[PDB]
Design a protein around this ligand. Structure first.
Ligand SMILES: CCNC(=O)CN[C@@H](C)c1ccc(F)cc1F
Ligand SMILES: CCNC(=O)CN[C@H](C)c1ccc(F)cc1F
Lengths: 237, 300
């Protein structure tokens, strides 16, 4: 059934699993028309499909042309997500296919189940965790590849950079979730924290800066402070 | 007008015959039901006074044989049997009519309720859902499970309703996942009607039989089947207009006959609200929506 705080270490066992987040698939700006009505204009989106044990991120870029002439786009976006996830699974060798797919939003359950009927042995699960994967478009390199895309495209990343050389996947996922939660609560402050010191760089093949172990402890502490603050600033506490 | 003779009534029992029921006391001089209308299937059903657990009964059509009931003290139930000696049977029914030991099927002349509940129900289709080929009548009880319930444990005692599953390869054409899931017309019209049932009359017959088993025996898998067959039609954007008009009549009479005190367990809130207010057919079931809103506004 659902994945929650009780069964959290399951994410880091040796059964292949993927999280799927659809929150950035259908993205729009809302604007006024010459007549004073309101309209939307789509911008490119992405499906965020992540193996939490290895850090592998299958980032399927959703180009605005897929919405041309279609109705009920928010509903279609869920089915398009499920179609692309199913296509990804079918493209992987059998030994690389997931045994579980965890959707971050429960409205993805029926679309993914129907698209995966050919895979009765892959479990489709919801979660009770409020995971911050919507903030993936606050990662500069990810936002850049999405906004520049001129056609549908899949781009593969490791969202943990090289962290798994020095830390476990539990610790790496916890660091990722902290970073993304911070970027979601106050993107400007979060990004200042990450890029304040100019002597720490992001390698060309990485997404995050090359912090030493000690600097990561300091960074992580700064991000917790932010989340607690903003939580004060918000509820006035 | 046909007759079902009872050898005797050795245990106190409530006997129902279609929508009617009468109370028989232990060893009361009870010898059957006469004046049963010809042309319809019928059900004769039983609830013992001492153990209201297990309602059970028999679907039959008196055109197919001469049937009687006799109490078996070993298996502890009233059993339907066929009498092959027409001479003996006609003689027995006569002697019993003379002594006024049989109750008369109490139908009001104006009343079309039983016809309206069984319009499409045929004994031959009942006998394919309830498989016991050596008898011309069919036993059903409260506890019998359906084939679909058994997939999720005695096959001989199962209700072989047609399996309906909205998240199945049968229901979903490869490449039409969203389309077929959100509009079930291909599963209704091509898979079920053209492929399995052959026509809408057979579909409606099974739907009507499922409802009646739910209502008379509290058979849970039959209630599930009834609602699934309703939901399949309501969730189809494309349904022949004659089928929608007939469904409205069918459901109207089912809702009219449903005991008020059983509506809480026999009606699924989700299905009815979806069907009457959200589905493609939300504006096609006028009679059913009107009786539901006036009789069971709470559920909605
Ligand atoms: C061989 C023993 N079996 C029978 O006599 C079964 N015959 C039925 C028609 C019957 C018999 C006696 C009754 F009082 C009432 C009946 F309905
Ligand atoms: C209008 C009456 N309706 C009923 O259910 C109750 N009428 C009595 C009890 C009755 C029922 C069935 C029967 F075959 C013979 C009967 F006298």
């Amino acid at each position: 059934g659902a994945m929650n705080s009780s069964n959290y270490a399951e994410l880091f066992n040796n059964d292949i699993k993927l999280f799927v987040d659809d929150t950035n698939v259908y993205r729009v700006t809302v604007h006024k028309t010459f007549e004073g009505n309101v309209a939307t204009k789509a911008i490119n989106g992405c499906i965020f499909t992540l193996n939490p044990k290895t850090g592998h991120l299958f980032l399927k870029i959703i180009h605005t042309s897929v919405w041309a002439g279609q109705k009920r786009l928010s509903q279609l976006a869920k089915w398009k997500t499920a179609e692309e996830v199913s296509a990804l699974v079918r493209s992987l060798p059998k030994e690389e296919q997931p045994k579980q797919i965890i959707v971050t939003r429960k409205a993805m359950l029926d679309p993914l189940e129907v698209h995966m009927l050919d895979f009765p042995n892959i479990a489709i699960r919801p979660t009770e965790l409020r995971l911050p994967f919507s903030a993936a478009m606050s990662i500069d390199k990810l936002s850049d590849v999405v906004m520049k895309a001129t056609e549908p495209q899949m781009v593969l990343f490791n969202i943990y950079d090289d962290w798994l050389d020095r830390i476990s996947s539990y610790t790496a996922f916890s660091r990722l979730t902290l970073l993304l939660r911070a970027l979601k609560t106050n993107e400007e402050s979060a990004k200042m924290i990450l890029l304040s010191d100019p002597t720490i760089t992001i390698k060309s093949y990485h997404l995050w800066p090359s912090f030493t172990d000690e600097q990561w402890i300091t960074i992580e502490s700064q991000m917790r402070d932010l989340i607690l603050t903003e939580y004060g600033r918000k509820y006035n506490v | 007008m046909n007759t079902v003779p009872f050898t005797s009534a050795p245990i106190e029992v409530t006997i129902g015959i279609d929508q009617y029921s009468f109370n028989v006391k232990e060893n009361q001089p009870f010898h059957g039901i006469k004046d049963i209308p010809i042309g319809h299937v019928h059900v004769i059903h039983f609830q013992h006074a001492d153990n209201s657990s297990m309602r059970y009964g028999y679907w039959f059509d008196c055109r197919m044989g001469n049937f009687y009931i006799q109490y078996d003290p070993k298996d502890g139930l009233y059993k339907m049997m066929e009498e092959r000696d027409g001479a003996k049977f006609e003689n027995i029914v006569h002697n019993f009519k003379e002594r006024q030991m049989m109750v008369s099927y109490p139908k009001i002349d104006e009343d079309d309720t039983w016809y309206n509940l069984t319009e499409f129900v045929q004994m031959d289709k009942i006998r394919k859902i309830v498989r016991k080929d050596e008898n011309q009548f069919s036993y059903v009880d409260s506890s019998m499970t359906t084939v679909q319930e058994n997939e999720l444990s005695d096959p001989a005692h199962s209700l072989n309703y047609t399996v309906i599953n909205f998240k199945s390869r049968e229901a979903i054409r490869p490449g039409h996942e969203m389309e077929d899931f959100l509009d079930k017309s291909y599963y209704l019209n091509t898979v079920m009607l053209q492929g399995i049932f052959k026509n809408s009359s057979n579909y409606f017959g099974e739907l009507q039989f499922a409802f009646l088993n739910a209502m008379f025996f509290g058979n849970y898998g039959s209630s599930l089947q009834w609602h699934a067959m309703i939901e399949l039609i309501c969730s189809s954007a494309t349904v022949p207009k004659h089928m929608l008009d007939k469904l409205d009549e069918i459901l109207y009479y089912q809702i009219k006959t449903l005991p008020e005190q059983y509506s809480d367990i026999l009606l699924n809130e989700r299905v009815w609200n979806i069907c009457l207010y959200s589905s493609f057919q939300k504006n096609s079931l006028h009679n059913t929506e009107k009786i539901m809103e006036n009789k069971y506004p709470e559920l909605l």
